[PDB]
Symmetry: D3
Subunit: 100 residues, 6 copies
């Protein structure tokens, strides 16, 4: 079974401030999302994330991650993640899931 989707994170004004887990990064923000598979798997599927949209301010550095936290049989937690003085106007992450 193979399922796909898209996560439009949008502007980072709507993102939440989260506490840094990398000592070299501060002001870490993130639009986290809990995606739920249409047809649940039984064993957690292999998931790939892909950044398919980007709108980032040119005066400051491009700092972006498409972070994949975890994958259960039922869904997964992933996020658009930026930090420092980066400004993200728009970030979308397409994803895919395959059983095994």
């Amino acid at each position: 079974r193979v399922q796909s989707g898209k996560i439009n994170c949008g502007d980072d004004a709507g993102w939440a401030k989260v506490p840094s887990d990398d000592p070299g990064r501060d002001n870490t923000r993130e639009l986290a999302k809990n995606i739920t598979f249409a047809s649940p798997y039984c064993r957690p599927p292999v998931v790939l994330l892909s950044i398919t949209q980007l709108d980032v301010e040119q005066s400051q550095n491009l700092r972006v991650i498409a972070r994949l936290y975890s994958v259960s049989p039922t869904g997964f937690k992933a996020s658009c993640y930026t930090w420092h003085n980066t400004k993200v106007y728009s970030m979308s992450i397409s994803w895919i899931s395959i059983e095994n």
Copy 2:
């Protein structure tokens, strides 16, 4: 059946101006492509797009999309998509296709 490929869009001087479908975007351009599968599927495969190359002018904002329009059993329409005063010297999109 799993098939893969790469779409080298190149410079955006060669891209076509297309009419905006987002009210907040103007001067929308796009290198659209109609990809045809080597071995045709019968049911449309799940397709994932991935931006694997980028060459973008630093003086203006990074505005890029890897837009996936549609997927038939026989192929798919996707594009490199930029807008406003963004300059893209180079954009390649790797893709993958899986039956179900």
Copy 3:
């Protein structure tokens, strides 16, 4: 069989200078990596690369590739690839592999 992973290339000070294979590019650098599949395939799997992290200096152009050189049944060679006066502080490439 489906396998996944992540290649953290990091800062490009640690990358090697490699000779250009594109006449229009100079000062080409690259963090090449030889990934080996946990469970070896017998026929080379289809592999997709995806840039899931980016930290790039804003004063100079964003020049990055997620280059996929080759794929054997046993593994694959891929790299984070930049050139000219681009500065990459961070680049991670998530990948996926599927038999056929």
Copy 4:
């Protein structure tokens, strides 16, 4: 996609006399059936036949075939086949179908 089923041919009084295609066999009879897959394939599936029931007269020889004539993407023609003075009171053929 994998589909299964069962073909209860029953008594051979209800079977049709068909013309022999083997010179050494006469009085060839056969309960032919045209099975149609619930979910049609696109490429013809590999089909296996299996005799899972038998009720045959002991005074004469056991002559039975589970003959698989053809396989389209949409279904298949198979039959319970006996000949000479064999008497079949009952013959069921379970089958399986797999894409490829």
Copy 5:
């Protein structure tokens, strides 16, 4: 996931008498077995039964079934089934299971 196996029912002296569920059959006996998959499925697999061994008394009729009662994700109930004055010295049933 595909799993296989074999059910040696042996002599029908060791089989249990079970009550007939077909009005035209009496003295119905059966060696029922509850098979459990090594690697459990999550959705019940499609199962095919196949009689791969037979030792039957020639003075009386060949009456045998390879009956497939049910299939759960975890296993299945099947049996060697005979009736009337048939004598089975030996009956083995090979089986196969496939997810979907």
Copy 6:
């Protein structure tokens, strides 16, 4: 990958006498065959045997096996197997093979 086939053993006059491996059986004969897959597997496929043809003398007992000896990635050894005073005029074994 799924492959199928048929093994027509024919008359048991052409079968070889082989030494018994069951103490209760004598005069054991067998038409052994070494089948080779058209498209070789890499891991040995799961193989199911099925008797789809039978022509057996009624005056003596039906003693038949569809014996599956071994399965390599490249093929398999199986046989039509009878013993004692059983006479087999005809025995065909259909088979199927699936990767995993």
